[PDB]
Amino acid sequence: NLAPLPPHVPEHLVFDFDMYNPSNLSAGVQEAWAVLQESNVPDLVWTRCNGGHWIATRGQLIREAYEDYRHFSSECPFIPREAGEAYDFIPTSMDPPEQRQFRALANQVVGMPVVDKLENRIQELACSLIESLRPQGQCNFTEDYAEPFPIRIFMLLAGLPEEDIPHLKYLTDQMTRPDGSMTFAEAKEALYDYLIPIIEQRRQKPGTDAISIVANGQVNGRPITSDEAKRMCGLLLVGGLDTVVNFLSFSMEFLAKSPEHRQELIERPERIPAACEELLRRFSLVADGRILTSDYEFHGVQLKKGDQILLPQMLSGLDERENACPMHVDFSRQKVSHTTFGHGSHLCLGQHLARREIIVTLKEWLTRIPDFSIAPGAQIQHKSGIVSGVQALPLVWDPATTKAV
Numbered sequence: 001n002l003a004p005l006p007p008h009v010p011e012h013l014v015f016d017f018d019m020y021n022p023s024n025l026s027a028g029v030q031e032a033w034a035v036l037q038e039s040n041v042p043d044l045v046w047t048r049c050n051g052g053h054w055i056a057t058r059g060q061l062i063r064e065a066y067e068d069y070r071h072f073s074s075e076c077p078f079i080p081r082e083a084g085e086a087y088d089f090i091p092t093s094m095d096p097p098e099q100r101q102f103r104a105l106a107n108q109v110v111g112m113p114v115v116d117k118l119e120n121r122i123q124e125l126a127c128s129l130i131e132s133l134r135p136q137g138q139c140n141f142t143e144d145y146a147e148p149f150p151i152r153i154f155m156l157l158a159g160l161p162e163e164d165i166p167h168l169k170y171l172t173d174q175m176t177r178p179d180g181s182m183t184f185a186e187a188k189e190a191l192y193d194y195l196i197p198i199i200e201q202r203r204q205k206p207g208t209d210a211i212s213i214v215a216n217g218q219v220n221g222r223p224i225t226s227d228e229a230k231r232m233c234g235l236l237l238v239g240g241l242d243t244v245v246n247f248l249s250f251s252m253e254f255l256a257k258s259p260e261h262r263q264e265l266i267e268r269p270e271r272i273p274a275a276c277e278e279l280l281r282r283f284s285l286v287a288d289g290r291i292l293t294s295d296y297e298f299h300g301v302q303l304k305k306g307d308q309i310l311l312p313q314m315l316s317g318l319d320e321r322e323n324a325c326p327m328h329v330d331f332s333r334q335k336v337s338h339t340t341f342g343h344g345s346h347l348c349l350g351q352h353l354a355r356r357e358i359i360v361t362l363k364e365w366l367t368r369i370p371d372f373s374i375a376p377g378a379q380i381q382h383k384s385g386i387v388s389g390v391q392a393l394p395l396v397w398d399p400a401t402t403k404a405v
């Protein structure tokens with residue numbers, strides 16, 4: 001379903017990419033997107049799918065667009081428009097200078113100091129989940145570890161009941177990888193029906209959980225509103241539930257297939273940090289955009305006020321101009337260039353938590369279960385959207401090759 005080409009678009013710039021169902025999906029998600037970087041594709045293209053929108057295909061353009069909030073506003077950051085429209089998360093649907101005050105608070109909740117404090121639980125929970133898995137010689141990594149690990153830590157941070165997971169998780173998924181089961185607004189509403197009561201309850205009787213800190217926070221010398229708090233917490237949930245979860249499955253899927261990569265990490269543990277970076281570049285998975293605040297001419301292409309443009313954070317690091325042999329995983333690259341956690345003022349606050357969750361998992365999984373692989377005849381399927389994912393990850397191993405700790 002291609003929408004009719006708007007008048008201002010040179011037909012030579014058309015490239016019908018469907019962000020929700022790329023063509024090469026079988027080959028893998030990062031691979032399906034990278035077709036945008038082939039020689040036959042202009043740097044800046046227009047796609048008639050999902051209502052028509054621009055796509056910047058190169059690291060350089062993406063970084064520029066992200067730096068430029070004057071022209072490229074966060075107001076309507078999701079494609080399609082109804083989604084970017086219904087989207088009112090804070091600080092994500094705001095531009096500087098307004099953005100800054102909400103950012104500062106959100107930072108209080110997810111920042112470094114919080115990670116440092118939660119470190120022992122992270123380490124505790126991972127060791128526990130793995131040890132539990134170890135003797136089975138088989139899981140569903142996606143359901144068995146990728147989901148529980150990050151979510152339980154979040155539920156811990158937020159002081160929310162583990163029981164709300166399934167419900168919460170469904171709504172989150174609807175937003176990033178729309179099912180067709182519910183629209184963005186319907187989905188936004190449900191997450192909101194959820195948060196409302198809790199926030200109220202934490203304004204009256206504050207805790208030490210993330211929600212309490214948000215609900216009772218100060219912004220521009222005055223108290224945050226209830227609606228504002230609802231809107232921050234809404235974002236925290238989606239990052240908490242939907243990002244780390246998917247990243248881990250790509251990395252684990254990759255590790256299950258590359259014995260040599262596993263080994264390197266086992267023998268030269270000092271490399272874990274460099275490898276985490278490489279994996280964040282290679283298995284990057286977020287694609288959001290911006291809205292043109294006016295007519296603007298960008299790299300010789302005429303953009304019209306109101307046009308949306310996708311600036312796929314995923315693409316910067318896969319771009320050959322940025323990284324030689326981009327599709328190749330090399331833990332010892334001189335420079336790992338990516339924008340996996342974004343670029344500009346909206347640079348991801350949860351990056352610290354995310355990095356801690358990844359490193360712990362690698363170090364801990366490798367220690368106990370150094371040798372594993374994908375279940376014979378399982379066919380791994382990726383999914384595309386704002387946040388790309390893995391559907392299921394059937395792994396098998398010989399219990400006799402594991403090590404208890």
Ligand code: HEM
Nearest residue numbers: 091092239240243244247286340341342346348349350354
């Ligand atoms: C795999 C890990 C993650 C990746 C790849 C990721 C990616 C991103 C991206 C690309 C952005 C900027 C979007 C934009 O400019 O439109 C962002 C922003 C944000 N992320 Fe992360 N995210 C991850 C994990 C997390 C976690 C664990 C949290 C905290 C629970 C989180 C919280 C946030 C927040 C609060 C923002 C907004 C910052 C602002 O608007 O100034 N993210 N993330």
